[PDB]
Design a protein around this ligand. Structure first.
Ligand SMILES: [Mn+2]
Ligand SMILES: [Mn+2]
Length: 178
């Protein structure tokens, strides 16, 4: 799986994932499913931010904590949107709302509720993807066009298929915890 991750994801995503794991004392060479999951999540966030009009989204995920909060606080100050308790993933300048993105190995509805429960926000939009083509977004409002969403859904399916071909998928699929 470590070899899979390093050949599947671009070096910027892999570096960010390694850093995120080491910040919690986790070794990417040992907790390789986690390594894969973090990379997938980052890749989805960046894909999502590329799917709108130029300048539609601000990326928050993947930034160091200080810069992430600087971005969040700046946006809150200039738009008056409520300050979230936890860092979200993106800000949507069109809809004027923060976005929390999730990618799940279980099922989109359970992950959606867990995420709703964690952030406890009246205002932050949630969008969840699976590796088998399901999605689930707050108020069935999927933000992006069918084409952009299809690209994300296809990418995750492709990752799943590659894992399966290497006999990595069944361990990976069963590795997410409530
Ligand atoms: Mn995040
Ligand atoms: Mn997220």
């Amino acid at each position: 799986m470590e070899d899979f991750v390093r050949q599947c994801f671009n070096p910027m995503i892999v570096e960010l994932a390694e850093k995120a794991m080491k910040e919690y004392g986790e070794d990417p060479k040992i907790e390789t499913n986690k390594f894969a999951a973090i990379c997938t999540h980052l890749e989805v966030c960046f894909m999502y931010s590329d799917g709108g009009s130029k300048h539609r989204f601000e990326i928050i995920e993947g930034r160091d904590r200080i810069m992430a909060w600087t971005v969040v606080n700046s946006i809150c100050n200039t738009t008056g949107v409520e300050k979230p308790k936890f860092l979200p993933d993106l800000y949507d300048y069109k809809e004027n709302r923060f976005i929390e993105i999730g990618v799940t190995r279980r099922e989109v509805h359970i992950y959606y509720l867990e995420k709703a429960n964690k952030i406890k926000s009246e205002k932050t939009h949630i969008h969840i993807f699976s590796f088998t083509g399901e999605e689930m977004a707050t108020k069935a409002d999927y933000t992006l066009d069918e084409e952009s969403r299809a690209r994300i859904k296809t990418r995750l399916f492709t990752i799943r298929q590659e894992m399966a071909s290497r006999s990595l998928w069944d361990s990976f699929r069963q590795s997410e915890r409530a």
